[PDB]
Design a protein around this ligand. Structure first.
Ligand SMILES: Nc1ncnc2c1ncn2[C@@H]1O[C@H](CSCC[C@H](N)C(=O)O)[C@@H](O)[C@H]1O
Lengths: 285, 150
DNA sequence: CATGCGCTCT
DNA sequence: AGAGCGCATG
């Protein structure tokens, strides 16, 4: 009689380990979490915030089929490739096939190496995330390689910021409606620290660019504080993304560094929304 | 057994008859962007699948890697079953249009280091499951596993 | 039409 | 560190 086992996760392009974070928040017992990252700051954040639980590997393109076979079978395979060559926010983007774009295929590739062989009836879940603001050609091509259509989820519905994102995958109930939680902070005001007034209810998509915090045409300061207008503090921004307070306060990072990490990141309530039914498929802690 | 071949980005039908593989059993696609798995399966199981980059100095909108990735895609589409009914081979050819980075990506994806074949700076590279004239010698050995219509 | 998981250049 | 550029695109 099959019992539920702790989950085995391969995380490509792991960033600040949003996956493991969400998984732990859902109370899902994690057998192993193998992450592929190359940015030392991000790897530091993952290392510190999850106390060496994360087994790190180098470049994703240094991971081979033999490694997948050797690192045990994987219950879950999640990844979001860099979008600096995909997003239309970058005028000088090199597309899906040049630059960092081709790294998507590295996910693709590895997915098929990790996919349980035919005649294997074990549960296999995978999730690939990227931006909506990408060219139609690239989107179509990604859909053709992953043989699926994406699901648009916007963090506006569940957080204090706009984050329209495409999600390819096969997680149960990806298309189900999002639902706010008592823990969710939907208005920017709810994210601010004490003594600070928010000019906005929602903020526009936060990139790695510092002035993505500026709102609309006239580049308005998002907050006002004691006779002086101000931008978001890193803690407030963390709260906006749904991360626990002071999550990215490591490795003596400047505002720009932290924001560089967070701008590339996932919206925690969204990933929680996606991983939510998994707690019924694996052992709970 | 007779011929069953899938040709990509180039047509070797003219060469297939020349080396003795023709008898209609060849399929050829130029734009494979809107080709699904079912489209590959419905064309009958293929014994050999070919694809090659256009000779450099030819005109192409696509990046050098596009050909490789599409080839790998349709290749995974074309492979049979865990059980092995018959012989199945694949071949990808670079006309020296692949960047060092891109050919490294090729070697990474096809899980094989390319064999380089010279003309006599007019050479070509190839990734193949095999155990113009000079590489026609590479088109040759298939005759042992598949009947030739001479 | 307003917008963007960015780069560049001080 | 912060302002400008960029324009296809939903
Ligand atoms: N070649 C490569 N191999 C592995 N990771 C890479 C890589 N190139 C870039 N990356 C990493 O991939 C990440 C994609 S941004 C996604 C971060 C993550 N999904 C999060 O929620 O935070 C970047 O942070 C970058 O550091």
């Amino acid at each position: 009689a099959e019992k539920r086992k702790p989950i085995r996760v391969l995380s490509l392009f792991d960033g600040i380990a949003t996956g493991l974070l969400v998984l732990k928040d859902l109370g899902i017992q994690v057998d192993r979490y193998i992450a592929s990252e190359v940015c030392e700051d991000s790897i530091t954040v993952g290392m510190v915030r999850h106390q060496g639980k994360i087994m790190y590997v180098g470049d994703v393109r240094s991971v081979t089929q033999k490694h997948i076979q050797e690192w045990g079978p994987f219950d879950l395979v999640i990844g979001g490739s860099p979008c600096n060559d995909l997003s239309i926010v970058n005028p000088a983007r090199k597309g899906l096939y040049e630059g960092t774009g081709r790294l998507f295929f590295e996910f693709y590739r590895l997915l098929h190496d990790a996919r349980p062989k035919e005649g294997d009836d074990r549960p296999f879940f995978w999730l690939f995330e990227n931006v909506v603001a990408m060219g139609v050609s690239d989107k179509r091509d990604i859909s053709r390689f992953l043989e699926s259509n994406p699901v648009m989820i916007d963090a506006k519905e569940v957080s204090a910021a706009h984050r329209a994102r495409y999600f390819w995958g096969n997680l149960p109930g990806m298309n189900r409606p999002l639902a706010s939680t008592v823990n969710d902070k939907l208005e920017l005001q709810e994210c601010l620290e004490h003594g600070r007034i928010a000019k906005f209810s929602k903020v526009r998509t936060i990139t790695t660019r510092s002035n993505s915090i500026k709102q609309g045409k006239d580049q308005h300061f998002p907050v006002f504080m004691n006779e002086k207008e101000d931008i978001l503090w890193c803690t407030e921004m963390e709260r906006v993304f749904g991360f626990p307070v002071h999550y990215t306060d490591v490795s003596n990072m400047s505002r720009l560094a932290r924001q560089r990490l967070l701008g590339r990141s996932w919206s925690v309530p969204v990933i929680r929304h996606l991983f939510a039914p998994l707690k019924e498929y694996f052992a709970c802690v | 057994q007779p011929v069953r071949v899938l040709s990509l980005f180039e047509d070797i039908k003219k060469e297939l008859t020349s080396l003795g593989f023709l008898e209609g059993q060849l399929k050829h696609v130029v734009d494979v962007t809107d080709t699904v798995r079912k489209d590959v399966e419905e064309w009958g199981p293929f014994d050999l699948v070919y694809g090659a980059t256009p000779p450099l100095g030819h005109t192409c909108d696509r990046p050098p890697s596009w050909y490789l990735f599409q080839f790998h895609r349709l290749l995974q589409y074309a492979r049979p079953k865990p059980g092995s009914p018959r012989p199945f081979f694949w071949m990808f050819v670079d006309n020296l249009v692949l960047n060092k980075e891109d050919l490294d990506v090729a070697s990474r994806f096809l899980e094989m280091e390319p064999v380089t074949i010279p003309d006599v700076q007019n050479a070509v590279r190839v990734w193949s499951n095999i155990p113009t004239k000079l590489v026609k010698n590479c088109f040759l050995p298939l005759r042992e596993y598949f009947k030739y219509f001479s």
